[PDB]
């Protein structure tokens, strides 16, 4: 298979605007949302149809209870950070955990936290320790590393449990996650540069580049973002400035899902 990943996010806000949740938790498989929970609904709900069709109500009821507990702990932790920073007003607390099953069979695993959208604590599951960015994170690092058993639990969940969940969700939505829609690629001119655009492709992982007489020139190329089209497919582009004083052989190169494509500009 291609590379796949499973990730869970948590977002906590200390003094949210009226109606805005103070806690949100969303899971992803690759770029697809699969689960959602917030402090307003207080319910864990599917965000992909193949998740709802393969997970019994017992699953959603159980993790709804766990998420209500995780919501309270997140509030206590954000309360503690903002007190240690001596910060007033509204501030954000974020967490991301997940794993990757690479194409060659190897695995990766990660867990980290953020305060106000900046790295705060990063877990190293090989050295079994937390990397702190400042002294407020250092104080939290000391308390978390004193509970050695929970560090071992995180290593096992990242390396064993997370991978098992990923393979499980991968089978549930294999019609979506493991399909291939090749891109449609074209070249047009705009004032003067050559824009090579692709659209209608899945998975979103695509590599587009321009070459001049068979040689890459990355500093010259302008790369566009891979953007969702809204129908499950994606689109992207890449432009390069045209030299009006000398003729050169420009060619857009597109690689997607094991297939390489070359469009020579006449």
């Amino acid at each position, epitope marked *: 298979m291609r590379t796949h990943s499973l990730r869970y996010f948590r977002l906590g806000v200390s003094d949210p605007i009226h109606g805005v949740p103070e806690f949100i938790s969303v899971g992803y498989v690759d770029s697809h949302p699969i689960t959602t929970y917030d402090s307003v609904t207080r319910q864990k709900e599917p965000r992909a149809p193949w998740m709802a069709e393969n997970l019994a109500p017992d699953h959603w009821e159980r993790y709804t*209870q766990l998420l209500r*507990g995780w919501q309270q702990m997140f509030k206590v932790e954000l309360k503690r950070l903002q007190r240690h920073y001596n910060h007033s007003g509204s501030h954000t607390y974020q967490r991301m955990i997940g794993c990757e099953l690479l194409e060659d069979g190897s695995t990766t695993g990660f867990l980290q936290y953020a305060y106000d959208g900046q790295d705060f604590l990063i877990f190293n599951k090989d050295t079994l320790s937390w990397l702190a960015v400042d002294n407020v994170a250092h104080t939290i690092k000391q308390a978390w590393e004193a509970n050695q058993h*929970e560090l071992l639990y995180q290593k096992n969940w990242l390396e064993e449990e997370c991978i098992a969940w990923l393979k499980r969700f991968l089978e549930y939505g294999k019609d979506t996650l493991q399909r291939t829609e090749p891109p449609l690629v074209r070249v047009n001119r705009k004032e003067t540069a050559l824009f090579c655009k692709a659209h209608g492709f899945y998975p979103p992982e695509i590599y587009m580049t321009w070459m001049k007489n068979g040689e890459e020139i990355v500093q010259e190329i302008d790369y566009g973002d891979i953007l969702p089209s809204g129908d499950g497919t994606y689109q992207a582009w890449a432009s390069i400035e045209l030299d009006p004083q000398s003729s050169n052989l420009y060619s857009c190169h597109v690689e997607h899902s094991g297939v390489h494509m070359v469009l020579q500009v006449p």
Partner: antibody, heavy 109, light 116 residues
Framework: GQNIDQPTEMTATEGAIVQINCTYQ??????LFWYQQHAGEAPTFLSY??LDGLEEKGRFSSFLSRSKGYSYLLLKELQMKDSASYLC??????????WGAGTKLIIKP | NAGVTQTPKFQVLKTGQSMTLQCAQD?????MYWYRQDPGMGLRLIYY???????DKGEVPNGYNVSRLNKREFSLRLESAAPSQTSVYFC??????????????FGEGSRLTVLE
């Protein structure tokens, strides 16, 4: 389904060594616990294992093998106060605790 | 200091009688549980409370109800006692739930005998 298996009863001599086994078949694994429960009293936490290997805690040691799906609680230099039931419990993928029936340890003075 | 305090220690009941078991913890824990222990089998969860403000059924909820009155207290209710509910009931608590290594702290236990 999910089952936890441990011997019903073990008898050993004072001053000797006893090994209490616990095998588990569960959907997912988030750690194995050992608890001590004296007769007519509440269980109390003894140990936790989640990675492979042996961890020591005084006279008690706890081993875990995730691949074989079994653990043992090792009691050295047995004393009469070690007479109790020893409960093993496993957290599954949904963080639910699945309890073994418990092993009653009888110590011959 | 006190840990988990549950009452009563013993109780005889007639079939159909009502009964409420009390449980309080002073360890500032968030998760509380009600177990029943029977010969020949492991502890079975009746009900649990992952945190203050939420409760959910365990493995054997039928015949029981619970109330997470506050962060400290978690009562178990037997509305119509049945002979099958003759057991030893244990209330427990943990700092949080949904974590691997957090252990349980048990109360002293309540021995109920229900008779026709």
């Amino acid at each position: 389904g999910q089952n936890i298996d441990q011997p019903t009863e073990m008898t050993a001599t004072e001053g000797a060594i006893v090994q209490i086994n616990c095998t588990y078949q569960t959907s997912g694994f988030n750690g194995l616990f050992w608890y001590q429960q004296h007769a007519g009293e509440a269980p109390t936490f003894l140990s936790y294992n989640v990675l492979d290997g042996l961890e020591e805690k005084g006279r008690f040691s706890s081993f875990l093998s995730r691949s074989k799906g079994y653990s043992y609680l090792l009691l050295k230099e047995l004393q009469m106060k070690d007479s109790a039931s020893y409960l093993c419990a496993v957290k599954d993928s949904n963080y639910q605790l699945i309890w073994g029936a418990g092993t009653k340890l009888i110590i011959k003075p | 200091n006190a840990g988990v305090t549950q009452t009563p220690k013993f109780q005889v009941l007639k079939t159909g009688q009502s009964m409420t078991l009390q449980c309080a913890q002073d360890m500032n824990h968030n998760s509380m549980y009600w177990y029943r222990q029977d010969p020949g089998m492991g502890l079975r969860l009746i009900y649990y409370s992952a945190s203050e403000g939420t409760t959910d059924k365990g493995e054997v909820p039928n015949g029981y109800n619970v109330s997470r009155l506050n962060k400290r207290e978690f009562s178990l209710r037997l509305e119509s006692a049945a002979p099958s509910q003759t057991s030893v009931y244990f209330c427990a608590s943990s700092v949080w739930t949904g974590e691997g290594s957090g252990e349980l702290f048990f109360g002293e236990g309540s021995r109920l005998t229900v008779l026709e």
